[PDB]
Amino acid sequence: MLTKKFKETLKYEGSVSLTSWGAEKSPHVTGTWISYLQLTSDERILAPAAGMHYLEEDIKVNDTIYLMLGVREVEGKNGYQGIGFRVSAKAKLISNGPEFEMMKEKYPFLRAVLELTPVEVEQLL
Amino acid sequence: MLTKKFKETLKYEGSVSLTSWGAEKSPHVTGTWISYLQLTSDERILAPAAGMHYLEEDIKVNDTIYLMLGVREVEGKNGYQGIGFRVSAKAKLISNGPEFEMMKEKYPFLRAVLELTPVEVEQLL
Ligand SMILES: Cc1cc2nc3c(=O)[nH]c(=O)nc-3n(C[C@H](O)[C@H](O)[C@H](O)COP(=O)(O)O)c2cc1C
Numbered sequence: 001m002l003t004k005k006f007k008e009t010l011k012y013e014g015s016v017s018l019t020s021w022g023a024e025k026s027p028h029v030t031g032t033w034i035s036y037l038q039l040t041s042d043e044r045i046l047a048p049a050a051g052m053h054y055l056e057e058d059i060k061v062n063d064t065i066y067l068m069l070g071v072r073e074v075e076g077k078n079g080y081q082g083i084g085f086r087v088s089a090k091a092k093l094i095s096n097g098p099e100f101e102m103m104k105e106k107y108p109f110l111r112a113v114l115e116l117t118p119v120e121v122e123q124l125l
Numbered sequence: 126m127l128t129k130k131f132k133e134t135l136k137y138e139g140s141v142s143l144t145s146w147g148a149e150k151s152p153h154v155t156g157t158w159i160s161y162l163q164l165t166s167d168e169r170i171l172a173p174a175a176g177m178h179y180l181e182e183d184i185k186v187n188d189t190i191y192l193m194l195g196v197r198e199v200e201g202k203n204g205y206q207g208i209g210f211r212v213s214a215k216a217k218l219i220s221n222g223p224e225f226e227m228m229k230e231k232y233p234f235l236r237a238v239l240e241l242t243p244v245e246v247e248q249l250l
């Protein structure tokens with residue numbers, strides 16, 4: 001599901017966009033940092049949730065989000081310097097357990113872990 | 126509308142996400158680079174559109190979009206290394222005129238210019 005190139009991107013830094021929708025007429029966009037993402041052995045993507053109020057209300061209605069990220073330092077299609085990804089994922093927020101404990105240690109500011117289950121990965125460059 | 130800090134971020138490179146909706150069902154997320162963004166004297170934000178076919182279909186119905194970007198290298202609020210913005214904008218695709226011409230010189234791959242009129246700017250860190 002998560003290619004070698006996707007995994008390579010996660011070694012750099014950049015803005016991650018999280019698009020959610022369903023609780024209001026318009027969608028919401030929430031950010032995180034590539035360096036805050038943690039890959040699990042079953043290739044779930046975890047991020048520290050500090051605020052993410054709107055995204056939480058959206059995913060109570062529609063648990064599908066879009067993640068977008070891109071870095072200049074990874075070679076895209078046709079040697080193009082730069083790569084981007086659009087990931088469709090199912091979202092839930094985790095408030096306890098060993099992964100929460102592991103993330104709470106790295107990111108003391110978090111109230112919950114955002115757990116993303118990738119359902120589709122599109123490499124865009 | 127566009128602050129000193131926002132203008133400072135546009136010196137760096139990173140992923141820009143553009144969230145659009147209306148052409149029906151779920152939102153779309155499209156990307157560009159901070160290095161492809163150009164500010165006009167009246168503080169419109171221009172980007173080269175090579176693809177953006179689904180955003181194009183959304184804005185015919187709902188011309189409001191959400192741009193998100195962030196860079197680690199800029200100091201945010203309080204004791205924070207990094208800055209992010211969410212910009213709400215009215216969007217239009219431009220096919221000719223002097224701005225098309227200037228963007229086409231810089232970005233010869235574009236078919237059209239995405240013109241964003243900022244209606245709200247939120248500093249998120
Ligand atoms: C690049 C970037 C990184 C961010 N990282 C996080 C983060 O890891 N966790 C978080 O809770 N908010 C983060 N934010 C802020 C979120 O976008 C969001 O505004 C905040 O969680 C409050 O969202 P809300 O208005 O829906 O409550 C980040 C913003 C940007 C632009």
Ligand SMILES: Cc1cc2nc3c(=O)[nH]c(=O)nc-3n(C[C@H](O)[C@H](O)[C@H](O)COP(=O)(O)O)c2cc1C
Binds near residue numbers: 083
């Ligand atoms: C970091 C990043 C930068 C991108 N830059 C552009 C760009 O400047 N113009 C563009 O048309 N597509 C760009 N793309 C790809 C778009 O997201 C989009 O998929 C593409 O235009 C193909 O048409 P579509 O929008 O209908 O999918 C970029 C992707 C990423 C991840």
